[PDB]
């Protein structure tokens, strides 16, 4: 698998691929690894499928209960700290999952949480089997002065390189840009096909 999360000026862009295996044997050509976890933050999935979906359900639960009780969205450091505490309270029966939460509260953030519950900020992060390819292209092409369109084009080029060079990665890329003004919006698949045909990554 491969996930990516990129923080730029006033937005944070996250995308996954959609392929689930679950065996060697790629079984589901259209999965769901990118989840809207609250009204201004999302979570990606790059581990064991069942454990990861249970983590997504618990985090949707606790963040919605949060927003209902306190009537304000949870900060990104707070949700990643909560997620770290959950993953580290049970580490000798652990969740084999690599998480990556990202969102915006007063500044765009993306955090990366491993299976033992170590949360650490970075300006761009990635989890999954096809992670080093997207770290290569992000290291070579990333700029903090990008716009949202240049950022989502960089994200699509990244996941495309990971799909070209990795077996467990594949399928149609779903990308969701979360900004403060428009909220969590996920790009439709026709727009992503248009960006792929514009960038010349279709064959």
């Amino acid at each position: 698998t491969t996930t990516v999360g990129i923080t730029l000026k006033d937005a944070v862009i996250m995308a996954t691929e959609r392929r689930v295996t679950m065996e060697n044997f790629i079984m589901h050509k259209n999965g769901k690894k990118l989840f809207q976890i609250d009204t201004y933050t999302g979570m990606t999935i790059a581990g064991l499928v069942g454990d990861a979906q249970v983590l997504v359900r618990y985090m949707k639960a606790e963040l919605e209960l949060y927003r209902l009780q306190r009537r304000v969205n949870m900060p990104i450091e707070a949700v990643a700290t909560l997620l770290s505490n959950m993953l580290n309270q049970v580490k000798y029966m652990p969740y084999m999952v690599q998480l990556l939460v990202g969102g915006i509260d007063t500044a765009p953030h993306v955090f990366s949480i491993d299976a033992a519950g170590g949360s650490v900020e970075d300006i761009y992060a990635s989890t999954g089997s096809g992670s080093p390819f997207v770290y290569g292209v992000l290291e070579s092409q990333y700029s903090e002065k990008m716009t949202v369109d240049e950022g989502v084009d960089l994200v699509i080029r990244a996941i495309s390189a990971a799909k070209q060079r990795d077996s467990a990665s594949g399928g149609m890329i779903d990308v969701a840009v979360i900004t403060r003004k428009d909220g969590y919006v996920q790009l439709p698949t026709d727009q992503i096909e248009s960006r792929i045909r514009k960038l010349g990554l279709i064959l």
Binding site: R57, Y58, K60, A61, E62, E64, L65, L68, Q69
Partner: protein, 226 residues
């Protein structure tokens, strides 16, 4: 007489659960009604002093993005029971993936109230609530009772103006109704009862229409219907 912990009467009464119902008769009035494609909840909010932070005290409280609740009675028991309802809705979100019935949610809270109606060593919950929201079935409007009794309404009341408001609703309620005329009818109901202190105030009022999430009015919008 041991008529001061929950045991039976010389004729068929639970005196403590009665006494809790007269505790919720001493509360602040609130009501709710269905309209054409949703349901509203209006609480009276009678902000007594000027030092109370008017909008930040809220008696219409959200249980989910797809169930809300307004309460009446002892306000501490109210807050604890509403928090139980919130975490129960979250349990059903974790277990089943969505809140497909709001009746299940009122039934679990009402079982919680029946327990403290049933057991000794503890008093009943002296609080009454109405739940409102849409589910897969559609718009639902419930009521809750210190015994844990639930009833489903098209429109109901709770509080000090229970009976006066329920009389006005019993006369003047129309089943399918646009949202604007619905909140107008609800305010007329709240008026006729609470205009015995010859004042109402700006009340607090929320609404859903089926498909959308939750919308609680602001201070400016309710005074147009006032």
């Amino acid at each position: 007489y041991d008529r001061a912990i929950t045991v039976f009467s010389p004729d068929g009464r639970l005196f403590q659960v009665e006494y809790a119902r007269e505790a919720v008769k001493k509360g602040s009035t609130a009501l709710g009604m269905k309209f054409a494609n949703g349901v509203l909840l209006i609480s009276d909010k009678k902000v007594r002093s000027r030092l109370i932070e008017q909008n930040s005290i809220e008696a219409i409280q959200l249980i989910d993005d797809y169930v809300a609740a307004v309460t009446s009675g002892l306000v501490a028991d109210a807050r604890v029971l509403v928090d139980f309802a919130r975490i129960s809705a979250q349990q059903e979100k974790v277990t089943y993936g969505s809140l497909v019935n709001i009746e299940n949610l009122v039934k679990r809270v009402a079982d919680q109230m029946q327990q403290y109606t049933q057991y000794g060593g503890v008093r009943p919950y002296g609080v009454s609530l109405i739940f409102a929201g849409i589910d897969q079935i559609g718009p639902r409007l419930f009521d809750c009772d210190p015994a844990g009794t639930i009833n489903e309404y098209k429109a109901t009341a709770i509080g000090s103006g229970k009976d006066a408001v329920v009389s006005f609703l019993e006369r003047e309620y129309k089943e399918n109704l646009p949202e604007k005329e619905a909140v107008t009818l609800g305010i007329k109901a709240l008026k006729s009862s609470l205009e015995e202190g010859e004042e109402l105030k700006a009340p607090e009022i929320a609404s859903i229409t089926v498909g959308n999430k939750y919308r609680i009015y602001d201070q400016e919008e309710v005074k147009k219907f006032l």
